[PDB]
């Protein structure tokens, strides 16, 4: 619902050799958008108009690693706690006292902690699809994992260089297998990490999404030019240092308003999920979108732009 | 914020092929857009930048067409006030601004009037520092005009390409702290820089530091002037005809939008006089008048301007 060369481009160094790129469209209170894995600003296509419309002044990032965000290397340049105090920085620098966050994915596990932690920092809390859980103090990390099976392909990500090299390979290949309907899907991250790696037994030439034009796959093609998938994928290597982190928090509940939106056909982040958000957020607000996949804002924009303006408009 | 550079949020839009404007960007609410004269940048806004955003405004100083990271294109007619003011409509477009505030001090303030006359339905309020709005006479030129006043013979001296360039170029340094003094401690003589060769012809080859800037600051302008040197800056002095023309097709009608005009006691090129009959023209003007201050007014005097840029936007333009 835009080309980028009709956008605000904003650049925040948050430290020395690290700058976050933000789309910025609107005027009214800040709300920051903040994408999941692997993916961009520009996930955001159908909500930047439509909240900026709304009266909200939009900041779309392009989180650490992705686009023309810094991409350091070090795994641990990709834990919640780096990311979180990153981000905070960036409303410093930016003269913002607050902001409403809006994640997906991965973008919505950064919202909640920065809830959690920078609560005075947080207006109001959306995400899409990532529920929040609080730190479970003796089940082992890695033992969630390997006890649900949709998780295996966590595990083809944990080995540095192995599922960069099958990402990178051919990047229109990696966008059309992964930006699909639930229905059209070529993928099964239930046999992941024994059967071969993820597009093994999958189409050389995948068709096109009814989700995505040529357009929007080769916009995401020349993004990944820039840095690849090694920043990307170290957000899914810091689970030990993150537990640890989340650990810290103890007692402490989320005061702020909240929101949860679930996608009945996303099956790695299944809405039952979030099932007991209430007994850690009772005032939390919650969205569901029926017919919608892992890739929310671009399977249901219609949807997503109602549940989010009401809303911002109502809590916060 | 003030001092540093890389402190700040940095913001680009392209407003058309070969040009895009950058900005600095601090605090939340009401857009205030603040656009600098000749020869700055966002920077001679350093003191209001920080005092803006507290006060609960959302900041955006420009690098103005021709300066600091803004694409500096060779051309003149591209620095007219028409092409200047098309593309600060693009750039609040593109940013998705239905309004915004304009202030804007010396070239800058010429700019937000004429914004204010052709694009009011943008422009949510307009304050001028030094800069007064006088309506086009269809009878008299600029150079008739310009002739006339004796302080304005510099402006002559800049109208031939490539001379005011190699004198302002030659030691950058030796510009800016030329240039960036208080009224009192000027080295400079506005009356015959065309007779008497040039600019800085007679004035000292290492100036002291004025009492209004430190050596750090001078350096700040010194490198963002070794990109593109003063071509596109002093092109926004070559369109003075086609200015008077562009002004003219305005045919009379009225700044109907709240206005602030401030006035500095020792600018002796934009006197505080030449405001005189600015209401006739600007039903809702209000003004200011800042004591003992030459033409750079932001620096010279930043607590007053902070103070008077600050009271009239929470009376005039919402907070
Ligand atoms: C289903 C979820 C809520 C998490 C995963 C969600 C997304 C992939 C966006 C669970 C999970 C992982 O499966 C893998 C991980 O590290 C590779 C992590 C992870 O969440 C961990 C976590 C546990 C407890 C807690 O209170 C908060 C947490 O983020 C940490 C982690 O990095
Ligand atoms: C109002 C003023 C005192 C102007 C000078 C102001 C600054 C140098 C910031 C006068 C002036 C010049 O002296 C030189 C100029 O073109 C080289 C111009 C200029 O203003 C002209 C102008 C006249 C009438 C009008 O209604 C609007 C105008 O912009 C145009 C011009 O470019």
Redesign the interface.
């Known amino acids: 619902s835009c080309n980028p060369?009709?956008?605000?481009?904003?650049?925040?160094?948050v430290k020395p050799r690290v700058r976050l790129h933000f789309v910025?469209?609107?005027?009214g209170?800040?709300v920051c958008l903040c994408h999941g894995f692997p993916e961009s600003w520009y996930s955001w296509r159908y909500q930047i108009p439509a909240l900026?419309q709304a009266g909200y002044?939009?900041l779309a990032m392009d989180m650490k690693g992705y686009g023309e965000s810094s991409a350091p290397p070090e795994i641990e340049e990709y834990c919640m706690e780096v990311l979180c105090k990153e981000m905070v920085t960036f409303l410093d620098?930016?003269?913002?006292?607050q902001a409403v966050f809006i994640g997906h994915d991965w973008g919505g596990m950064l919202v909640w902690y920065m809830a959690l932690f920078y609560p005075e920092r947080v207006r109001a809390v959306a995400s899409l699809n990532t529920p929040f859980i609080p730190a479970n103090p003796n089940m082992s990390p890695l033992e969630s994992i390997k006890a649900n099976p949709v998780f295996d392909y966590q595990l083809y990500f944990q080995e540095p260089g192995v599922a960069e090299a099958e990402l990178e390979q051919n990047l229109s290949r990696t966008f059309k297998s992964l930006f699909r309907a639930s229905d059209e899907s070529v993928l099964s991250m239930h046999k992941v990490c024994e059967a071969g790696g993820l597009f093994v037994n999958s189409p050389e030439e995948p068709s096109l999404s009814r989700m995505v034009t040529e357009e929007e796959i080769q916009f995401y093609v020349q993004q990944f030019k820039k840095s690849g998938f090694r920043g990307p994928l170290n957000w899914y290597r810091n689970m030990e240092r993150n537990w640890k982190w989340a650990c810290k928090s103890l007692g402490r509940k989320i005061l702020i308003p909240a929101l949860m939106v679930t996608a009945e056909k996303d099956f790695v982040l299944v809405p039952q999920m979030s099932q007991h958000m209430e007994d850690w957020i009772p005032h939390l607000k919650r969205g569901h979108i029926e017919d919608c996949g892992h890739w929310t804002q671009m399977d249901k924009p219609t949807e997503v732009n109602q549940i989010l303006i009401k809303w911002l408009d109502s809590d916060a």
């Open positions: 060369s009709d956008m605000s481009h904003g650049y925040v160094t910025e469209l609107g005027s209170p800040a900026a002044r939009v620098k930016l003269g913002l006292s």
